Ligand binder design. Structure first.
Ligand SMILES: O=c1[nH]c(=O)c2nn[nH]c2[nH]1
Ligand SMILES: O=c1[nH]c(=O)c2nn[nH]c2[nH]1
Ligand SMILES: O=c1[nH]c(=O)c2nn[nH]c2[nH]1
Ligand SMILES: O=c1[nH]c(=O)c2nn[nH]c2[nH]1
Ligand code: NA
Ligand code: NA
Ligand code: NA
Ligand code: NA
Lengths: 295, 295, 295, 295
């Protein structure tokens, strides 16, 4: 037998950082969950019980805190790139670092119409994520995403004209509820190293904001022919607005809401044009994916 | 042996309702999870296999959908009271109904600065809940609550002057992070029946809004001596603003964020006044409760 | 306003303890999650910011570890009683302690047909729990339970003869699947104090074992007329076998498995006597409760 | 823009099947959660709103139930291969099917030392899984796994001799607790089609049993130098026992249990050789992965 692939590190490292403006008294908080996995010349830890090649996962944890102390943690694309680069530069035998960051929302409270200097609310479990792969001699690959963005529209969704055969019971419809949890990922062109990532810092927050805005507007305004058609429109627009993105991937559940026929009860009308009360279905769910790139 | 207490019914009934304004084209959605448990002269179903006394839980489910079709589902205090009353009026041998409703957020989207007519976002997993106990000959008892409101302040929280003995290691502090998930419940005076609940309909949404506003403002503005002292200030204000409330109960976890001593690493200063990076603790957590009533 | 009720403490305290037999080399592990909430003369911490009356929740945490170091942690009824008594004896102004313990399964591995001395497996998320209320001058009240015991029988369950009216669509059945997650609680007679709890130590594990055995056997062997009738048979037997129990409470979801009509597809027969493939329903679910006591 | 990749289908399809032996009266149940995603000539559903190429996800759901009605559902490797093959054979424009199956445990109850004919218990949330990729013209690729197998050993684990630098605080140890949740995957050699999968049917259950047995025995008996070294020993043995496996992958969290220094309290000794009470850590956790193949 031989080791074909190996990686190891620390997962689920929760980190909070506060920035305090001495002039204004305004404080800003960041909270993330971080995972770092390393690869390199470590096969002998598996095959020969040679621990000398192991940077202990506990040390990886310490390194995350130290790096957060000495560097900006925003945008997460930058922090992830700093953190990954550290490991390949510090340890001769480590040749790749894989950094995943999940950013949790702490949104400044408005109290009596004014932004509060040091109080925050978790407005939704929507996350902003990054995956950063730092590979020695191959640069820095960054995938940015938003996830857990849950939306619903109560009309202006259709689904007709699909294949009908002996396995089909679904009725065509020209008016249905459409609800999903949005997972959207944009992959940046490969960066040569940290200097290049630094050069593009302003683009990271702006592209996240654009991706979110395009997602919401397209969902709200499209008279949707299918999840497939609406998601493609989203991806097309993001690629048009940021030339440094190579691909956009969407993964969308179709969270079904079923009509309830109540006609058995005193002829009550609750289907089609008369439908008011529906039964949300926890499972199963459609799952629709697509990756869109450039011609 | 004897049956000392019994209740049964249907839990986890998901319900969605849409309201469509024909004039404006504006649609409004409501989504809830409902539980209904019944009590009454049903002992023989347990002791003698006498199913004749059982309103099937499946029928309870149907009743929830039918009731939602024929009645307003908002405010939930009203819907719960209608639903509970139905069972005690319809079935001679049923003498109490216990209705729990959890309301999920579907907040209208703003697209380009204007409210969208039929598109919604789940902005946080904060819930608005009601528990309604309808007891034949004893009226309607309603407990309203908000839950899952997660907040954090990065300063203006203190904790000193507590009991110190041989079990104590905690250091006194004049500046710490305070974070919690708010669970707040206000109990209404007993209502004589549905007519009285209807008479107070406007008070339900207004009191929820007040409870939420008082919670947020007090949390943000109090230079907190402890969770105990801050929560009492919240409860006091709610009772002052709504005379039909008899008690207010808060249940608050103290979600700890620990300083990380980094001085072992090149004398890095990250404690006390120099603290920037902290470790959020998933467990354990303080849990502080209080019920406040009138003199 | 006035404080009507207050309690506070530490939740979610994870504790592991190992016992090592020097003679045999056999090791035995216990893992629990503990919550302790205190009541007493603490109103002024809420109303006056008087922290002098507060035993810090951090100190409660330390006390749990110290108590586990110096005492047996099994049976949990005993450990809970020791822990609760500590607080009322140590602190003059604390008058009640409420201790909840959840015990996690670590079952010794059998390797090649022999019990391993120090290796364990988590065989299911079934828990053994205790709630212990130690109230000064009123003794020790203990509720023991098992929870998360998930079972299914594929036949020998019936449900017919229930009330039928204009809200009823459920068909009567003489053969259905019955599946539930068992939550069973037995409440002990009040104990005068720790000496009396110690005197009954052997009864605690034996009664848990009996409760579990009666639950499983009755479920498997009863040709069930309803969840109500089967659960009553369980409770009756437990009360018969342990005279120091005052009441038994069961809370049982009815986890539905629906027939799937496939007759639309080439006349495939999958209902009634021909039913082979079913659709488990995640929600909604029936919920059936009963508390059984002595004549 | 262009569609670079696309797949769609139905997720979270819960399925139960019962087998009834008419001769013996013995019943056997299977419960699974199934996901099926399709690929093929479907780009126009995304780019042109052409639904004619879409096999509706609802129809995929129906197909899963029909296929389960007409075929064995065990071993899951076979069922997955039947299900995947169906889609590529039935639909000209569908060229790949991706089938994921999670099998839930329903273990026959022993009542009074005898196996019960129709009563079952969920003994742990351990799963047996398969991923089957059926690709037209490229055969059938099957990855089998077990997951959610949670184990702990209280001694006979060591970790010393790792890299020490200015980021290291971890002390070397010759005796620690080791606990993990095992995720183990074995990848079969590519099969040419369904006939070949059928020819190897007996190997599937046998290899699962072997993988589980090797995992448990190795964990229990290895005086472990690290998670890395122990997991490699596991993978080596599985590859030795089944020649039709090409690779074995393990992914193991290191679930930490920390010593608690109690010496501040009356000199209580609870570290090193005196350690009895530990604090299980929910997060962070080490994460160690390896893929082992043949020389
Ligand atoms: O078994 C281990 N492997 C590791 O890589 C490691 N790092 N810290 N502790 C550890 N334990
Ligand atoms: O066992 C049952 N008890 C009930 O009360 C019920 N209601 N619907 N189905 C049921 N099954
Ligand atoms: O606000 C607090 N209240 C308490 O009771 C406590 N105990 N430890 N820390 C604490 N903080
Ligand atoms: O938008 C949809 N896309 C699909 O592929 C599908 N299949 N069933 N319903 C559906 N809705
Ligand atoms: Na390197
Ligand atoms: Na009545
Ligand atoms: Na006392
Ligand atoms: Na094909």
């Amino acid at each position: 037998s031989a080791v074909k692939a190996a990686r190891y590190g620390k997962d689920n490292v929760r980190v909070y950082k506060v920035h305090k403006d001495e002039k204004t008294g305004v404080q800003t908080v960041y909270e993330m969950t971080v995972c770092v996995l390393l690869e390199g010349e470590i096969e002998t830890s598996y095959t020969k019980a040679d621990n000398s090649v192991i940077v202990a996962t506990d040390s990886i944890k310490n390194t995350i805190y130290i790096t957060a102390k000495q560097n900006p943690v925003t945008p997460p694309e930058l922090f992830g790139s700093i953190l990954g680069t550290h490991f390949i530069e510090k340890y001769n035998h480590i040749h790749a670092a894989h950094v995943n960051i999940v950013c949790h929302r702490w949104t400044r409270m408005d109290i009596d119409g004014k932004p509060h200097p040091h109080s925050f609310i978790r407005d939704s479990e929507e996350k902003r994520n990054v995956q950063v792969d730092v590979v020695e001699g191959k640069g820095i690959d960054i995938k940015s995403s938003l996830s857990g963005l849950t939306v619903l529209k109560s009309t202006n969704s259709q689904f007709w004209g699909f294949l009908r055969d002996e396995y089909t019971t679904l009725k065509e419809t020209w008016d249905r509820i459409l609800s999903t949890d949005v997972d959207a990922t944009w992959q940046w062109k490969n960066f040569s190293g940290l200097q290049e990532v630094r050069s593009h810092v302003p683009k990271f927050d702006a592209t996240w904001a654009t991706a979110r805005e395009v997602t919401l507007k397209t969902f709200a305004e499209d008279n949707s022919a299918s999840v497939q058609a609406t998601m493609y429109k989203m991806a097309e627009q993001i690629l048009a607005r940021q030339q440094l993105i190579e691909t956009v991937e969407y993964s969308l559940p179709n969270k079904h809401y079923f009509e309830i026929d109540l006609s058995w009860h005193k002829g009550l009308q609750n289907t089609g044009k008369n439908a008011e009360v529906f039964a949300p279905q926890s499972d199963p769910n459609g799952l629709i994916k697509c990756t869109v790139g450039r011609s």
